[PDB]
Every structure is written in C-alpha cells, then in structure tokens.
Amino acid sequence: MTQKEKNETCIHVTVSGKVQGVFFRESVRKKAEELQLTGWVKNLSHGDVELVACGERDSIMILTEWLWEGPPQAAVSNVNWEEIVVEDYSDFRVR
Ligand SMILES: [Cl-]
C-alpha cells in the first residue's frame, strides 16, 4: 500500500438529536477541515445529520468523539458510525 492508503480510511455516520437550526452541517465541515478530513455532510430533512469522513484514523476518531458534543446549542442523543469501503474526496463539502 501507499502511505496514504495505509494510513487513511473512511467512515459513515448518522447523528441524532437536536441537530437542526444550529448550523450542524457547517460545523462538521469546519471541524473536519481542521482535522484534515475529506468527505461530506448533510442534514436529513426531519431526521439525522449524515456524513462521510475520510482521512487519518486519529483524526477520524477525534471527529467521532466530537460529534457527541457538536456546535453550540446542539443536543446530540446518539452517534452511530461504521468504517466503509474507501471513497475518494479532495475536500469536505456540505450537501
Ligand atoms: Cl462546502
């Protein structure tokens, strides 16, 4: 494997709770960028926040812990993640 291939993976996450009207999408993108992760995030209508995050595993695991807190005024009730088949992204975007 290349070093990037060896040292990186991807996860898929859903985040439940009070996650609307608190700029959750933007906060995930900003946090991900600070952790040098790529992927995407959206707010499912009437539902959970959903994201894919790819990059180094330490960063991934810092993100998954942070998702229990979220941005100010967020009230997260659950974070459900799994590692997935790797997908290629050049940046982290809101969707
Ligand atoms: Cl974006």
Task: Residue 90: give its domain's CATH number.
Answer: 3.30.70.100
Cα 52 to Cα 25, 49, 73, 87, 92: the distances in Å are 12, 11, 23, 9, 9
Catalytic residue check, 80: no
Ligand 1 centroid–CA 29 distance in Å is 7
- Helical ranges in 2-89 per DSSP H: 3-7, 24-34, 57-66
Ligand 1 centroid–CA 41 distance in Å is 9
Report residue 33 as tokens. Answer: 């960028």
Q: What does the angle CA 61 – CA 54 – CA 56 come to, to the nearest 5 degrees?
A: 55
Contact 74, 41 (CB under 8 A): no
Ligand 1 centroid–CA 93 distance in Å is 4
CB atoms within 10 A of CB 55: 22
Cα 87 to Cα 20, 37, 71, 77, 84: the distances in Å are 27, 12, 26, 27, 8
Determination technique used: X-ray
CB atoms within 10 A of CB 34: 13
- Domain of residue 38 covers 2-95
In whole angstroms, what is the distance from residue 62 CA to residue 54 CA? 12
Catalytic residue check, 43: yes
Residue 88's contacts (CB-CB under 8 Å, 6 or more residues apart) are 54
Number of domains the chain is built from: 1
Ligand 1 centroid–CA 78 distance in Å is 24
